[PDB]
Design a protein around this ligand. Structure first.
Ligand SMILES: CC(=O)N[C@@H]1[C@@H](O)[C@H](O)[C@@H](CO)O[C@H]1O
Ligand SMILES: CC(=O)N[C@@H]1[C@@H](O)[C@H](O)[C@@H](CO)O[C@H]1O
Ligand SMILES: *[C@@H]1O[C@H](CO)[C@@H](O)[C@H](O)[C@H]1NC(C)=O
Ligand SMILES: *[C@@H]1O[C@H](CO)[C@@H](O)[C@H](O)[C@H]1NC(C)=O
Lengths: 123, 124, 124, 123
Protein backbone atom coordinates (compact mmCIF):
# COMPACT_ATOMS: atom_id res chain seq x y z
CA UNK A 1 0.00 0.00 0.00
CA UNK A 2 0.98 3.65 -0.55
CA UNK A 3 1.47 6.17 2.30
CA UNK A 4 -0.74 9.11 1.21
CA UNK A 5 -0.48 12.72 2.54
CA UNK A 6 -4.20 13.51 2.06
CA UNK A 7 -6.29 13.57 5.24
CA UNK A 8 -6.06 14.77 8.80
CA UNK A 9 -2.94 14.44 10.93
CA UNK A 10 -1.92 15.33 14.39
CA UNK A 11 1.61 15.53 15.80
CA UNK A 12 3.56 14.84 18.91
CA UNK A 13 2.92 18.40 20.24
CA UNK A 14 -0.88 18.39 19.75
CA UNK A 15 -0.99 20.49 16.50
CA UNK A 16 -3.32 19.28 13.75
CA UNK A 17 -3.15 19.56 9.99
CA UNK A 18 -5.43 18.66 7.08
CA UNK A 19 -4.00 18.19 3.59
CA UNK A 20 -6.23 17.96 0.55
CA UNK A 21 -5.83 15.91 -2.62
CA UNK A 22 -2.39 15.75 -4.18
CA UNK A 23 -2.69 16.49 -7.93
CA UNK A 24 -0.66 14.86 -10.81
CA UNK A 25 2.22 17.32 -10.33
CA UNK A 26 2.53 16.43 -6.64
CA UNK A 27 1.02 19.70 -5.37
CA UNK A 28 -1.26 19.94 -2.36
CA UNK A 29 -2.63 22.63 -0.09
CA UNK A 30 -4.03 22.37 3.41
CA UNK A 31 -4.45 23.98 6.80
CA UNK A 32 -2.25 23.81 9.89
CA UNK A 33 -3.99 24.20 13.29
CA UNK A 34 -2.16 25.07 16.42
CA UNK A 35 -3.13 26.11 20.01
CA UNK A 36 -1.81 29.44 21.28
CA UNK A 37 -1.81 28.24 24.87
CA UNK A 38 -0.41 24.73 25.56
CA UNK A 39 -3.39 22.61 26.83
CA UNK A 40 -5.94 25.45 26.16
CA UNK A 41 -8.84 26.66 24.01
CA UNK A 42 -7.39 29.37 21.68
CA UNK A 43 -6.93 27.80 18.21
CA UNK A 44 -5.49 29.49 15.07
CA UNK A 45 -5.52 28.12 11.60
CA UNK A 46 -2.97 28.93 8.84
CA UNK A 47 -2.73 27.72 5.20
CA UNK A 48 0.08 25.50 3.98
CA UNK A 49 1.20 24.76 0.40
CA UNK A 50 3.70 22.24 -0.89
CA UNK A 51 4.60 19.21 -2.98
CA UNK A 52 5.13 15.51 -2.79
CA UNK A 53 7.93 14.18 -4.96
CA UNK A 54 6.51 11.88 -7.57
CA UNK A 55 9.74 10.53 -9.12
CA UNK A 56 9.52 6.66 -9.40
CA UNK A 57 6.02 6.98 -7.77
CA UNK A 58 7.40 5.65 -4.50
CA UNK A 59 4.90 4.16 -2.03
CA UNK A 60 6.76 6.23 0.68
CA UNK A 61 7.37 9.63 -0.99
CA UNK A 62 9.32 12.58 0.35
CA UNK A 63 7.55 15.92 0.50
CA UNK A 64 7.79 19.46 1.79
CA UNK A 65 5.45 22.32 2.61
CA UNK A 66 5.48 25.88 3.83
CA UNK A 67 3.14 27.13 6.51
CA UNK A 68 2.33 30.77 6.01
CA UNK A 69 1.51 31.79 9.61
CA UNK A 70 -1.40 34.20 9.76
CA UNK A 71 -0.78 35.33 13.34
CA UNK A 72 2.81 36.37 13.04
CA UNK A 73 5.49 37.50 10.63
CA UNK A 74 7.27 34.09 10.69
CA UNK A 75 7.27 31.23 8.17
CA UNK A 76 7.89 27.50 8.81
CA UNK A 77 8.89 24.87 6.22
CA UNK A 78 8.62 21.15 6.88
CA UNK A 79 10.15 18.36 4.86
CA UNK A 80 9.99 14.63 5.46
CA UNK A 81 8.89 11.27 4.14
CA UNK A 82 5.48 9.50 4.32
CA UNK A 83 6.28 6.03 5.74
CA UNK A 84 4.48 2.89 6.34
CA UNK A 85 5.84 2.31 9.82
CA UNK A 86 6.99 -1.09 11.13
CA UNK A 87 3.59 -1.44 12.88
CA UNK A 88 1.88 -0.91 9.49
CA UNK A 89 0.58 2.62 10.38
CA UNK A 90 1.18 5.69 8.13
CA UNK A 91 3.51 8.19 9.74
CA UNK A 92 5.00 11.45 8.49
CA UNK A 93 8.51 11.87 9.91
CA UNK A 94 9.41 15.57 9.39
CA UNK A 95 11.92 18.18 10.32
CA UNK A 96 11.24 21.89 10.11
CA UNK A 97 12.93 25.33 10.01
CA UNK A 98 11.09 28.23 11.67
CA UNK A 99 12.25 31.62 10.30
CA UNK A 100 11.56 34.68 12.38
CA UNK A 101 11.50 38.16 10.95
CA UNK A 102 14.52 40.32 12.02
CA UNK A 103 14.86 44.05 11.28
CA UNK A 104 18.50 44.27 10.55
CA UNK A 105 20.52 41.96 8.30
CA UNK A 106 23.08 41.88 11.18
CA UNK A 107 20.60 39.75 13.23
CA UNK A 108 19.95 37.27 10.44
CA UNK A 109 22.26 34.69 12.15
CA UNK A 110 19.79 34.10 14.97
CA UNK A 111 16.53 34.00 12.97
CA UNK A 112 16.26 30.21 12.27
CA UNK A 113 15.11 27.47 14.68
CA UNK A 114 15.12 23.78 13.79
CA UNK A 115 13.17 20.81 15.14
CA UNK A 116 11.21 17.69 14.23
CA UNK A 117 7.60 16.67 14.20
CA UNK A 118 6.09 13.22 13.79
CA UNK A 119 2.50 13.08 12.51
CA UNK A 120 0.04 10.23 12.70
CA UNK A 121 -3.58 10.04 11.38
CA UNK A 122 -6.50 11.47 13.35
CA UNK A 123 -9.25 9.04 12.33
CA UNK B 1 10.54 50.38 -1.37
CA UNK B 2 10.15 46.60 -0.71
CA UNK B 3 12.37 43.48 -1.19
CA UNK B 4 10.35 41.42 -3.75
CA UNK B 5 10.96 37.72 -4.49
CA UNK B 6 9.81 38.07 -8.13
CA UNK B 7 12.52 37.76 -10.78
CA UNK B 8 15.77 35.89 -11.30
CA UNK B 9 18.31 34.95 -8.60
CA UNK B 10 21.62 33.15 -8.32
CA UNK B 11 23.30 31.72 -5.24
CA UNK B 12 26.79 31.34 -3.78
CA UNK B 13 27.11 27.85 -5.31
CA UNK B 14 26.18 28.91 -8.91
CA UNK B 15 22.51 27.63 -8.80
CA UNK B 16 19.74 29.86 -10.25
CA UNK B 17 16.10 30.26 -9.63
CA UNK B 18 13.34 32.28 -11.13
CA UNK B 19 10.21 33.20 -9.28
CA UNK B 20 7.07 34.61 -10.93
CA UNK B 21 4.51 37.07 -9.50
CA UNK B 22 3.56 36.89 -5.84
CA UNK B 23 -0.21 36.86 -5.51
CA UNK B 24 -2.11 38.84 -2.88
CA UNK B 25 -2.15 35.73 -0.69
CA UNK B 26 1.66 35.58 -0.71
CA UNK B 27 1.83 32.48 -3.01
CA UNK B 28 4.40 32.12 -5.81
CA UNK B 29 5.86 29.45 -8.08
CA UNK B 30 9.32 29.38 -9.68
CA UNK B 31 11.92 27.12 -11.22
CA UNK B 32 15.24 26.09 -9.63
CA UNK B 33 18.31 25.08 -11.75
CA UNK B 34 20.79 23.52 -9.29
CA UNK B 35 24.57 23.62 -9.73
CA UNK B 36 25.07 20.79 -7.17
CA UNK B 37 23.47 17.41 -6.24
CA UNK B 38 24.01 14.64 -3.60
CA UNK B 39 23.07 11.90 -6.10
CA UNK B 40 25.27 11.19 -9.18
CA UNK B 41 22.12 11.79 -11.25
CA UNK B 42 22.02 14.22 -14.18
CA UNK B 43 20.51 17.56 -12.77
CA UNK B 44 17.49 19.18 -14.34
CA UNK B 45 15.33 22.26 -13.79
CA UNK B 46 12.72 21.63 -11.13
CA UNK B 47 9.63 23.52 -10.04
CA UNK B 48 9.34 25.29 -6.71
CA UNK B 49 6.24 26.47 -4.83
CA UNK B 50 6.10 28.70 -1.75
CA UNK B 51 4.63 31.65 0.07
CA UNK B 52 5.82 34.96 1.35
CA UNK B 53 4.40 36.00 4.69
CA UNK B 54 2.17 39.04 4.15
CA UNK B 55 1.53 39.97 7.81
CA UNK B 56 2.13 43.76 8.30
CA UNK B 57 3.18 43.96 4.61
CA UNK B 58 6.81 43.91 5.55
CA UNK B 59 9.34 45.58 3.34
CA UNK B 60 11.64 42.62 4.14
CA UNK B 61 9.23 39.65 4.46
CA UNK B 62 10.01 36.03 5.51
CA UNK B 63 9.17 33.34 3.02
CA UNK B 64 9.54 29.65 2.45
CA UNK B 65 9.39 27.33 -0.53
CA UNK B 66 9.68 23.65 -1.53
CA UNK B 67 11.77 22.51 -4.49
CA UNK B 68 10.21 19.40 -5.95
CA UNK B 69 13.28 17.84 -7.53
CA UNK B 70 12.58 16.18 -10.87
CA UNK B 71 15.81 14.20 -11.27
CA UNK B 72 15.67 12.47 -7.90
CA UNK B 73 13.33 11.24 -5.18
CA UNK B 74 14.38 14.04 -2.71
CA UNK B 75 12.67 17.29 -1.61
CA UNK B 76 14.34 20.41 -0.35
CA UNK B 77 12.63 23.29 1.57
CA UNK B 78 14.15 26.78 1.92
CA UNK B 79 13.15 29.49 4.29
CA UNK B 80 14.56 32.93 4.82
CA UNK B 81 14.06 36.70 4.53
CA UNK B 82 14.43 39.14 1.76
CA UNK B 83 16.75 41.98 2.84
CA UNK B 84 17.11 45.35 1.07
CA UNK B 85 20.16 47.54 1.94
CA UNK B 86 19.44 51.33 1.50
CA UNK B 87 21.25 52.03 -1.84
CA UNK B 88 18.77 49.37 -3.02
CA UNK B 89 20.50 45.93 -3.22
CA UNK B 90 18.30 42.88 -2.39
CA UNK B 91 19.68 39.67 -0.81
CA UNK B 92 17.77 36.51 0.11
CA UNK B 93 19.31 34.90 3.21
CA UNK B 94 18.05 31.36 3.42
CA UNK B 95 18.49 28.02 5.20
CA UNK B 96 17.35 24.77 3.74
CA UNK B 97 16.70 21.07 4.65
CA UNK B 98 17.40 18.55 1.93
CA UNK B 99 15.32 15.39 2.52
CA UNK B 100 16.56 12.16 0.88
CA UNK B 101 14.27 9.19 0.37
CA UNK B 102 15.24 6.14 2.42
CA UNK B 103 13.80 2.70 1.86
CA UNK B 104 13.25 1.86 5.53
CA UNK B 105 11.99 3.97 8.41
CA UNK B 106 14.98 2.54 10.35
CA UNK B 107 17.19 4.87 8.27
CA UNK B 108 15.04 8.00 8.70
CA UNK B 109 17.46 9.45 11.22
CA UNK B 110 20.16 10.13 8.59
CA UNK B 111 17.76 11.33 5.78
CA UNK B 112 17.97 15.17 6.42
CA UNK B 113 20.85 17.56 5.50
CA UNK B 114 20.87 21.21 6.43
CA UNK B 115 22.76 24.30 5.10
CA UNK B 116 22.45 27.85 3.86
CA UNK B 117 22.23 29.76 0.59
CA UNK B 118 22.51 33.45 -0.12
CA UNK B 119 20.85 34.62 -3.35
CA UNK B 120 21.44 37.84 -5.23
CA UNK B 121 19.64 39.21 -8.30
CA UNK B 122 20.87 37.89 -11.57
CA UNK B 123 23.07 40.55 -13.23
CA UNK B 124 21.75 42.49 -16.29
CA UNK C 1 17.10 18.36 43.22
CA UNK C 2 19.04 18.77 39.91
CA UNK C 3 19.09 16.94 36.51
CA UNK C 4 22.69 15.56 36.36
CA UNK C 5 24.36 14.27 33.19
CA UNK C 6 26.52 11.75 35.12
CA UNK C 7 25.63 8.09 34.64
CA UNK C 8 24.27 5.83 31.92
CA UNK C 9 21.72 6.78 29.24
CA UNK C 10 19.97 5.19 26.29
CA UNK C 11 18.17 6.86 23.40
CA UNK C 12 15.10 6.33 21.22
CA UNK C 13 17.21 4.53 18.60
CA UNK C 14 18.82 2.00 21.04
CA UNK C 15 22.24 3.82 21.35
CA UNK C 16 23.83 4.17 24.83
CA UNK C 17 26.18 6.57 26.41
CA UNK C 18 27.89 6.86 29.73
CA UNK C 19 29.11 10.10 31.15
CA UNK C 20 31.47 10.40 34.14
CA UNK C 21 31.64 13.14 36.80
CA UNK C 22 31.01 16.74 35.83
CA UNK C 23 33.80 18.92 37.18
CA UNK C 24 33.23 22.33 38.78
CA UNK C 25 33.96 23.93 35.41
CA UNK C 26 31.11 21.99 33.79
CA UNK C 27 33.44 19.64 31.79
CA UNK C 28 32.75 15.90 31.39
CA UNK C 29 33.86 12.97 29.25
CA UNK C 30 31.86 9.85 28.35
CA UNK C 31 31.60 7.00 25.88
CA UNK C 32 28.94 6.60 23.16
CA UNK C 33 27.92 3.14 21.77
CA UNK C 34 25.82 3.87 18.65
CA UNK C 35 23.03 1.60 17.39
CA UNK C 36 23.06 3.29 13.93
CA UNK C 37 25.62 4.58 11.35
CA UNK C 38 25.56 6.30 7.90
CA UNK C 39 28.64 4.38 6.73
CA UNK C 40 28.52 0.56 6.25
CA UNK C 41 31.46 0.41 8.68
CA UNK C 42 31.47 -1.82 11.76
CA UNK C 43 30.41 0.46 14.77
CA UNK C 44 32.53 0.77 17.86
CA UNK C 45 32.43 2.62 21.18
CA UNK C 46 33.71 6.16 20.81
CA UNK C 47 34.71 8.83 23.30
CA UNK C 48 32.73 12.00 23.85
CA UNK C 49 33.79 15.29 25.48
CA UNK C 50 31.56 18.22 26.45
CA UNK C 51 30.49 20.79 28.98
CA UNK C 52 27.40 21.61 30.94
CA UNK C 53 26.66 25.29 31.32
CA UNK C 54 27.06 26.23 34.98
CA UNK C 55 25.65 29.80 34.84
CA UNK C 56 23.09 30.27 37.71
CA UNK C 57 23.64 26.59 38.67
CA UNK C 58 20.50 25.57 36.89
CA UNK C 59 18.58 22.55 38.04
CA UNK C 60 17.98 21.82 34.33
CA UNK C 61 21.20 23.02 32.62
CA UNK C 62 22.00 23.19 28.86
CA UNK C 63 24.98 21.22 27.69
CA UNK C 64 26.78 20.19 24.55
CA UNK C 65 29.24 17.49 23.58
CA UNK C 66 31.25 16.13 20.63
CA UNK C 67 31.38 12.43 19.78
CA UNK C 68 34.72 11.67 18.20
CA UNK C 69 33.76 8.62 16.16
CA UNK C 70 36.45 5.94 16.10
CA UNK C 71 35.11 3.79 13.25
CA UNK C 72 34.77 6.59 10.72
CA UNK C 73 36.11 9.99 9.70
CA UNK C 74 32.92 11.85 10.90
CA UNK C 75 32.17 13.96 14.01
CA UNK C 76 28.82 14.50 15.63
CA UNK C 77 27.94 17.28 18.16
CA UNK C 78 24.88 17.15 20.44
CA UNK C 79 23.35 19.95 22.39
CA UNK C 80 20.33 20.02 24.62
CA UNK C 81 18.93 20.37 28.16
CA UNK C 82 18.52 18.04 31.01
CA UNK C 83 14.88 18.07 32.19
CA UNK C 84 13.61 16.68 35.51
CA UNK C 85 9.82 16.11 35.92
CA UNK C 86 8.65 16.45 39.60
CA UNK C 87 8.22 12.74 40.57
CA UNK C 88 11.93 12.72 39.64
CA UNK C 89 12.40 11.35 36.07
CA UNK C 90 15.30 12.88 34.05
CA UNK C 91 15.23 13.25 30.23
CA UNK C 92 17.92 14.69 27.97
CA UNK C 93 16.32 16.44 24.97
CA UNK C 94 18.98 16.92 22.35
CA UNK C 95 19.62 17.91 18.73
CA UNK C 96 22.70 16.92 16.86
CA UNK C 97 24.70 17.68 13.64
CA UNK C 98 26.50 14.75 12.07
CA UNK C 99 29.46 16.00 9.99
CA UNK C 100 30.77 13.67 7.26
CA UNK C 101 34.22 14.10 5.77
CA UNK C 102 34.20 15.08 2.10
CA UNK C 103 37.26 15.01 -0.10
CA UNK C 104 36.65 18.36 -1.80
CA UNK C 105 35.43 21.67 -0.43
CA UNK C 106 33.08 21.69 -3.46
CA UNK C 107 31.03 19.02 -1.66
CA UNK C 108 30.94 20.77 1.74
CA UNK C 109 27.36 21.85 1.21
CA UNK C 110 25.98 18.29 1.59
CA UNK C 111 28.32 17.20 4.48
CA UNK C 112 25.99 18.01 7.49
CA UNK C 113 22.94 16.00 8.71
CA UNK C 114 20.72 17.13 11.54
CA UNK C 115 18.24 15.33 13.88
CA UNK C 116 17.18 14.75 17.46
CA UNK C 117 17.69 12.23 20.24
CA UNK C 118 15.90 11.83 23.54
CA UNK C 119 17.86 10.00 26.25
CA UNK C 120 16.53 8.39 29.40
CA UNK C 121 18.44 6.78 32.28
CA UNK C 122 19.45 3.22 31.72
CA UNK C 123 17.08 0.95 33.68
CA UNK C 124 18.32 -0.84 36.85
CA UNK D 1 49.97 20.08 3.62
CA UNK D 2 47.60 19.45 6.55
CA UNK D 3 44.83 21.90 7.59
CA UNK D 4 45.49 22.35 11.35
CA UNK D 5 42.95 23.70 13.92
CA UNK D 6 45.61 25.23 16.23
CA UNK D 7 45.93 29.02 16.06
CA UNK D 8 43.75 32.08 15.85
CA UNK D 9 40.67 32.31 13.64
CA UNK D 10 38.08 34.85 12.88
CA UNK D 11 34.71 34.31 11.21
CA UNK D 12 32.32 35.95 8.84
CA UNK D 13 30.50 37.75 11.72
CA UNK D 14 33.63 39.23 13.37
CA UNK D 15 33.94 36.69 16.27
CA UNK D 16 37.43 35.38 17.04
CA UNK D 17 38.64 32.09 18.44
CA UNK D 18 41.99 30.65 19.50
CA UNK D 19 42.50 26.89 19.67
CA UNK D 20 45.53 25.37 21.34
CA UNK D 21 47.50 22.25 20.44
CA UNK D 22 45.55 19.16 19.46
CA UNK D 23 46.89 16.16 21.43
CA UNK D 24 47.28 12.51 20.16
CA UNK D 25 43.63 11.72 20.99
CA UNK D 26 42.39 14.65 18.90
CA UNK D 27 41.41 16.80 21.90
CA UNK D 28 41.86 20.56 22.02
CA UNK D 29 40.67 23.45 24.14
CA UNK D 30 40.50 27.14 23.33
CA UNK D 31 38.67 30.42 23.78
CA UNK D 32 35.85 31.95 21.77
CA UNK D 33 35.65 35.79 21.68
CA UNK D 34 32.57 37.64 20.69
CA UNK D 35 31.37 41.31 20.81
CA UNK D 36 28.19 42.05 22.74
CA UNK D 37 27.38 45.03 20.54
CA UNK D 38 27.79 44.59 16.74
CA UNK D 39 30.65 46.98 15.69
CA UNK D 40 31.45 47.95 19.35
CA UNK D 41 33.92 47.67 22.24
CA UNK D 42 32.37 45.19 24.75
CA UNK D 43 34.17 41.83 24.34
CA UNK D 44 33.45 38.56 26.25
CA UNK D 45 35.53 35.47 26.21
CA UNK D 46 34.25 31.90 26.79
CA UNK D 47 36.10 28.53 26.84
CA UNK D 48 35.53 25.86 24.22
CA UNK D 49 36.45 22.15 24.30
CA UNK D 50 36.31 19.56 21.57
CA UNK D 51 37.96 17.02 19.29
CA UNK D 52 39.33 16.56 15.84
CA UNK D 53 38.70 13.17 14.29
CA UNK D 54 41.98 11.42 13.72
CA UNK D 55 40.78 8.34 11.79
CA UNK D 56 43.01 7.84 8.64
CA UNK D 57 44.89 11.03 9.77
CA UNK D 58 43.21 13.03 7.01
CA UNK D 59 44.90 16.26 5.92
CA UNK D 60 41.37 17.86 6.09
CA UNK D 61 39.85 16.43 9.31
CA UNK D 62 36.34 16.88 10.64
CA UNK D 63 35.96 18.22 14.16
CA UNK D 64 33.49 19.54 16.70
CA UNK D 65 33.54 21.69 19.81
CA UNK D 66 31.25 23.06 22.46
CA UNK D 67 31.37 26.65 23.59
CA UNK D 68 30.36 26.98 27.20
CA UNK D 69 29.06 30.57 27.24
CA UNK D 70 30.03 32.39 30.41
CA UNK D 71 27.57 35.27 29.97
CA UNK D 72 24.40 33.30 29.55
CA UNK D 73 22.73 29.99 30.24
CA UNK D 74 23.04 28.83 26.59
CA UNK D 75 25.47 26.40 24.95
CA UNK D 76 26.62 26.29 21.30
CA UNK D 77 28.18 23.31 19.47
CA UNK D 78 30.00 23.66 16.17
CA UNK D 79 31.02 20.89 13.82
CA UNK D 80 32.78 21.13 10.48
CA UNK D 81 35.84 20.24 8.46
CA UNK D 82 39.28 21.94 8.22
CA UNK D 83 39.84 22.43 4.46
CA UNK D 84 42.56 23.55 2.28
CA UNK D 85 40.44 25.81 0.11
CA UNK D 86 40.75 26.04 -3.69
CA UNK D 87 42.84 29.21 -3.21
CA UNK D 88 45.23 27.21 -0.99
CA UNK D 89 44.11 28.96 2.27
CA UNK D 90 43.00 27.01 5.41
CA UNK D 91 39.31 27.46 6.12
CA UNK D 92 37.02 25.94 8.74
CA UNK D 93 33.55 25.45 7.25
CA UNK D 94 31.21 24.89 10.25
CA UNK D 95 27.59 24.68 11.20
CA UNK D 96 26.34 25.19 14.72
CA UNK D 97 23.35 24.58 17.05
CA UNK D 98 22.66 27.21 19.73
CA UNK D 99 20.60 25.76 22.63
CA UNK D 100 18.78 28.19 24.85
CA UNK D 101 17.64 27.32 28.34
CA UNK D 102 13.82 26.92 28.66
CA UNK D 103 11.97 26.47 31.97
CA UNK D 104 9.35 24.04 30.96
CA UNK D 105 9.84 20.87 28.90
CA UNK D 106 6.77 22.05 26.89
CA UNK D 107 8.94 24.86 25.37
CA UNK D 108 11.79 22.55 24.40
CA UNK D 109 10.63 22.62 20.72
CA UNK D 110 11.71 26.23 20.27
CA UNK D 111 15.06 26.14 22.13
CA UNK D 112 17.45 25.31 19.20
CA UNK D 113 18.76 27.70 16.52
CA UNK D 114 20.96 26.58 13.63
CA UNK D 115 23.41 28.45 11.40
CA UNK D 116 26.85 28.36 9.79
CA UNK D 117 30.15 30.04 10.34
CA UNK D 118 33.21 30.12 8.11
CA UNK D 119 36.54 30.81 9.82
CA UNK D 120 39.79 31.94 8.28
CA UNK D 121 43.19 32.60 9.97
CA UNK D 122 43.95 35.90 11.71
CA UNK D 123 47.69 36.18 11.04
C1 LIG E 1 -4.54 22.44 18.45
C2 LIG E 1 -5.78 21.68 18.02
O1 LIG E 1 -6.59 22.16 17.21
N1 LIG E 1 -5.90 20.46 18.52
C3 LIG E 1 -7.03 19.59 18.23
C4 LIG E 1 -7.81 19.23 19.50
O2 LIG E 1 -8.32 20.38 20.14
C5 LIG E 1 -8.97 18.31 19.15
O3 LIG E 1 -9.45 17.76 20.34
C6 LIG E 1 -8.50 17.14 18.29
C7 LIG E 1 -9.69 16.34 17.79
O4 LIG E 1 -9.14 15.21 17.15
O5 LIG E 1 -7.70 17.58 17.19
C8 LIG E 1 -6.56 18.26 17.67
C1 LIG F 1 34.93 40.34 18.72
C2 LIG F 1 36.43 40.51 18.69
O1 LIG F 1 37.13 40.27 19.69
N1 LIG F 1 36.94 40.89 17.52
C3 LIG F 1 38.35 41.13 17.32
C4 LIG F 1 38.63 42.58 16.90
O2 LIG F 1 38.20 43.49 17.88
C5 LIG F 1 40.13 42.77 16.68
O3 LIG F 1 40.31 43.98 16.01
C6 LIG F 1 40.69 41.68 15.77
C7 LIG F 1 42.21 41.78 15.71
O4 LIG F 1 42.60 40.84 14.74
O5 LIG F 1 40.29 40.38 16.19
C8 LIG F 1 38.88 40.28 16.17
C1 LIG G 1 22.76 30.50 -14.17
O1 LIG G 1 22.51 31.60 -15.03
C2 LIG G 1 23.78 32.10 -15.41
C3 LIG G 1 23.60 33.45 -16.06
O2 LIG G 1 22.81 33.21 -17.20
C4 LIG G 1 24.41 31.05 -16.34
O3 LIG G 1 25.59 31.58 -16.84
C5 LIG G 1 24.70 29.75 -15.56
O4 LIG G 1 25.10 28.66 -16.38
C6 LIG G 1 23.42 29.32 -14.85
N1 LIG G 1 23.70 28.31 -13.86
C7 LIG G 1 22.93 27.24 -13.95
C8 LIG G 1 23.19 26.16 -12.92
O5 LIG G 1 22.04 27.17 -14.83
C1 LIG H 1 22.73 -0.65 25.46
O1 LIG H 1 22.70 -1.16 26.79
C2 LIG H 1 21.63 -2.08 26.84
C3 LIG H 1 21.34 -2.42 28.28
O2 LIG H 1 22.52 -3.02 28.76
C4 LIG H 1 22.03 -3.30 25.99
O3 LIG H 1 21.05 -4.27 26.15
C5 LIG H 1 22.16 -2.90 24.50
O4 LIG H 1 22.72 -3.90 23.67
C6 LIG H 1 23.08 -1.68 24.41
N1 LIG H 1 22.98 -1.07 23.11
C7 LIG H 1 24.14 -0.86 22.52
C8 LIG H 1 24.09 -0.21 21.16
O5 LIG H 1 25.21 -1.18 23.09
Amino acid sequence: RKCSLTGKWTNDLGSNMTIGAVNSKGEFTGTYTTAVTATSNEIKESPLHGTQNTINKRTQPTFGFTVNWKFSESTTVFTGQCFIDRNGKEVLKTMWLLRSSVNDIGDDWKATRVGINIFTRLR
